[PDB]
Scaffold this active site. Structure first.
Site, PDB file in Angstrom:
ATOM      1  N   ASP A   1      -0.122  -7.692   1.383  1.00  0.00           N
ATOM      2  CA  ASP A   1       0.359  -6.324   1.469  1.00  0.00           C
ATOM      3  C   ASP A   1       1.878  -6.334   1.614  1.00  0.00           C
ATOM      4  O   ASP A   1       2.417  -6.062   2.683  1.00  0.00           O
ATOM      5  CB  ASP A   1      -0.306  -5.569   2.609  1.00  0.00           C
ATOM      6  CG  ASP A   1      -0.018  -4.078   2.644  1.00  0.00           C
ATOM      7  OD1 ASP A   1       0.492  -3.557   1.624  1.00  0.00           O
ATOM      8  OD2 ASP A   1      -0.294  -3.457   3.686  1.00  0.00           O
TER       9      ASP A   1
ATOM     10  N   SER B   1       3.753   1.920   8.297  1.00  0.00           N
ATOM     11  CA  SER B   1       3.524   0.923   7.262  1.00  0.00           C
ATOM     12  C   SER B   1       4.840   0.513   6.612  1.00  0.00           C
ATOM     13  O   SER B   1       5.642   1.371   6.273  1.00  0.00           O
ATOM     14  CB  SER B   1       2.583   1.460   6.221  1.00  0.00           C
ATOM     15  OG  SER B   1       1.327   1.793   6.793  1.00  0.00           O
TER      16      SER B   1
ATOM     17  N   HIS C   1       0.826  -1.201   0.000  1.00  0.00           N
ATOM     18  CA  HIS C   1       0.000   0.000   0.000  1.00  0.00           C
ATOM     19  C   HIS C   1       0.868   1.261   0.000  1.00  0.00           C
ATOM     20  O   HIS C   1       0.344   2.362  -0.166  1.00  0.00           O
ATOM     21  CB  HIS C   1      -1.055  -0.036   1.114  1.00  0.00           C
ATOM     22  CG  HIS C   1      -0.558   0.268   2.487  1.00  0.00           C
ATOM     23  ND1 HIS C   1      -0.348  -0.711   3.437  1.00  0.00           N
ATOM     24  CD2 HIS C   1      -0.297   1.437   3.093  1.00  0.00           C
ATOM     25  CE1 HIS C   1       0.057  -0.147   4.563  1.00  0.00           C
ATOM     26  NE2 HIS C   1       0.091   1.159   4.380  1.00  0.00           N
TER      27      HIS C   1
HETATM   28  C1  LIG Z   1      -2.002   2.334   7.755  1.00  0.00           C
HETATM   29  C2  LIG Z   1      -2.768   2.409   9.045  1.00  0.00           C
HETATM   30  C3  LIG Z   1      -3.933   3.127   9.088  1.00  0.00           C
HETATM   31  S1  LIG Z   1      -4.729   4.018   7.824  1.00  0.00           S
HETATM   32  O1  LIG Z   1      -6.032   4.351   8.306  1.00  0.00           O
HETATM   33  O2  LIG Z   1      -3.831   5.055   7.423  1.00  0.00           O
HETATM   34  N1  LIG Z   1      -4.887   3.012   6.566  1.00  0.00           N
HETATM   35  C4  LIG Z   1      -5.691   1.834   6.520  1.00  0.00           C
HETATM   36  C5  LIG Z   1      -6.458   1.445   7.616  1.00  0.00           C
HETATM   37  C6  LIG Z   1      -7.237   0.304   7.547  1.00  0.00           C
HETATM   38  C7  LIG Z   1      -7.277  -0.480   6.396  1.00  0.00           C
HETATM   39  C8  LIG Z   1      -8.128  -1.700   6.331  1.00  0.00           C
HETATM   40  C9  LIG Z   1      -9.318  -1.793   7.052  1.00  0.00           C
HETATM   41  C10 LIG Z   1     -10.076  -2.944   6.962  1.00  0.00           C
HETATM   42  N2  LIG Z   1      -9.739  -3.999   6.213  1.00  0.00           N
HETATM   43  C11 LIG Z   1      -8.598  -3.905   5.522  1.00  0.00           C
HETATM   44  C12 LIG Z   1      -7.773  -2.796   5.548  1.00  0.00           C
HETATM   45  C13 LIG Z   1      -6.507  -0.082   5.300  1.00  0.00           C
HETATM   46  C14 LIG Z   1      -5.713   1.060   5.353  1.00  0.00           C
HETATM   47  C15 LIG Z   1      -4.823   1.398   4.190  1.00  0.00           C
HETATM   48  F1  LIG Z   1      -4.904   0.517   3.196  1.00  0.00           F
HETATM   49  F2  LIG Z   1      -5.117   2.585   3.671  1.00  0.00           F
HETATM   50  F3  LIG Z   1      -3.531   1.447   4.531  1.00  0.00           F
HETATM   51  S2  LIG Z   1      -4.625   3.055  10.665  1.00  0.00           S
HETATM   52  C16 LIG Z   1      -3.329   2.067  11.269  1.00  0.00           C
HETATM   53  C17 LIG Z   1      -3.191   1.569  12.562  1.00  0.00           C
HETATM   54  C18 LIG Z   1      -2.096   0.783  12.874  1.00  0.00           C
HETATM   55  C19 LIG Z   1      -1.174   0.522  11.891  1.00  0.00           C
HETATM   56  F4  LIG Z   1      -0.102  -0.245  12.200  1.00  0.00           F
HETATM   57  C20 LIG Z   1      -1.276   0.993  10.603  1.00  0.00           C
HETATM   58  C21 LIG Z   1      -2.374   1.785  10.277  1.00  0.00           C
END
Ligand SMILES: Cc1c(S(=O)(=O)Nc2ccc(-c3ccncc3)cc2C(F)(F)F)sc2ccc(F)cc12
Ligand SMILES: [Zn+2]
Length: 216
Positions: free
Chosen positions: A89, A172, A45
Site C-alpha cells: 500500500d 492514510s 489506496h
Molecule cells: C483507512 C482506515 C480505515 S477504513 O475503514 O476507511 N479503510 C480500510 C479498513 C480496513 C481495510 C482492511 C481490512 C482487512 N484487511 C486488509 C485491509 C482496508 C481499508 C481500505 F482499504 F479501504 F483503506 S479504518 C482505519 C483505522 C486506522 C487507520 F490508521 C486507518 C484506517
C-alpha cells in the site's frame, strides 16, 4: 488522528494534504509527505482519477501564503498493490513542478513514534481542520494478528491496544516518524478505531522508491 494534539503550525513542513477525485463520488482525502521537491509519498489506496496536493497547510480551511496548491501529473502506485490484502500500500505522486522551499514547506517493537494527519478525530467525528499528531507505540507483530493479511516483513503494527490513541480514517498516507526518521505510512485498521493499526514498512520499498525517483 484520535487522542492526539494539534501540531505546532508548520512544524512538519513535509506534510501533504491530498484531495482525491473519483468519477462516481465526491472528493476523498489523505495525507502524504514530500520526499523530493516534486515527489510526494502516500498510500496506494489514496489513488484516484486525479489528485491535488496542498503543501504548507495547518488549518486546511484557511488559505494563507504558506499554501502551495500543486498539480499531480502522474500517480505511481506500487505494481503489486493488492486491493484485497492491501499488501504494498504505497504510491508516489509526481508533481507538475518542484515545490518552493520555505520555512513551512520542505522535504523529509516497543519504541514510540509520531504520526500526523488531518483525518477523523473519532468514529463519529469529521476530519480535523487542523493538522493533528499523536505518539504511538510500535508493537510486536502478534499484536496485529487479527488483521489476517498482516505481514511483519511488509508492515508495522502501531498503537498500544490499551490506549485510544491512533491514526484513523483520513490519515492514510501520512508518515510515521521514529526518532525523526520516517519508518511507516498509515495504511489501514479497524472501523471502530481500536488500535493497533497497520502501517506500510517503508524500508521494504526503498529499491522501488529509488527506481521511480531516478527514472522520473
Ligand atoms: C483507512 C482506515 C480505515 S477504513 O475503514 O476507511 N479503510 C480500510 C479498513 C480496513 C481495510 C482492511 C481490512 C482487512 N484487511 C486488509 C485491509 C482496508 C481499508 C481500505 F482499504 F479501504 F483503506 S479504518 C482505519 C483505522 C486506522 C487507520 F490508521 C486507518 C484506517
Ligand atoms: Zn501559517
Amino acid at each position: 488522528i484520535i487522542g492526539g494534539t494539534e501540531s505546532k503550525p508548520h512544524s512538519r513542513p513535509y506534510m501533504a494534504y491530498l484531495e482525491i477525485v473519483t468519477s462516481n463520488g465526491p472528493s476523498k482525502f489523505c495525507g502524504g509527505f514530500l520526499i523530493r521537491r516534486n515527489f510526494v509519498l502516500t498510500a496506494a489506496h489514496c489513488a484516484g482519477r486525479s489528485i491535488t496536493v496542498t503543501l504548507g497547510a495547518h488549518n486546511i480551511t484557511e488559505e494563507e501564503d504558506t499554501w502551495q496548491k500543486l498539480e499531480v501529473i502522474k500517480q505511481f502506485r506500487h505494481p503489486k498493490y493488492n486491493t484485497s490484502t492491501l499488501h504494498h500500500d504505497i504510491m508516489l505522486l509526481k508533481l507538475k513542478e518542484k515545490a518552493s522551499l520555505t520555512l513551512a514547506v520542505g522535504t523529509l517493537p516497543g519504541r514510540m513514534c509520531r504520526v500526523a494527519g488531518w483525518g477523523r478525530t473519532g468514529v463519529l467525528k469529521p476530519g480535523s481542520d487542523t493538522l493533528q499528531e499523536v505518539k504511538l507505540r510500535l508493537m510486536d507483530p502478534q499484536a496485529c494478528s487479527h488483521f489476517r493479511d498482516f505481514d511483519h516483513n511488509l508492515q508495522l503494527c502501531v498503537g498500544n491496544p490499551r490506549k485510544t490513541k491512533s491514526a484513523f480514517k483520513g490519515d492514510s498516507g501520512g508518515p510515521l516518524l521514529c526518532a525523526g526518521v520516517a519508518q511507516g505510512i498509515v495504511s489501514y485498521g479497524r472501523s471502530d478505531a481500536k488500535p493497533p493499526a497497520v502501517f506500510t514498512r517503508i524500508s521494504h520499498y526503498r529499491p522501488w522508491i529509488n527506481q521511480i525517483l531516478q527514472a522520473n
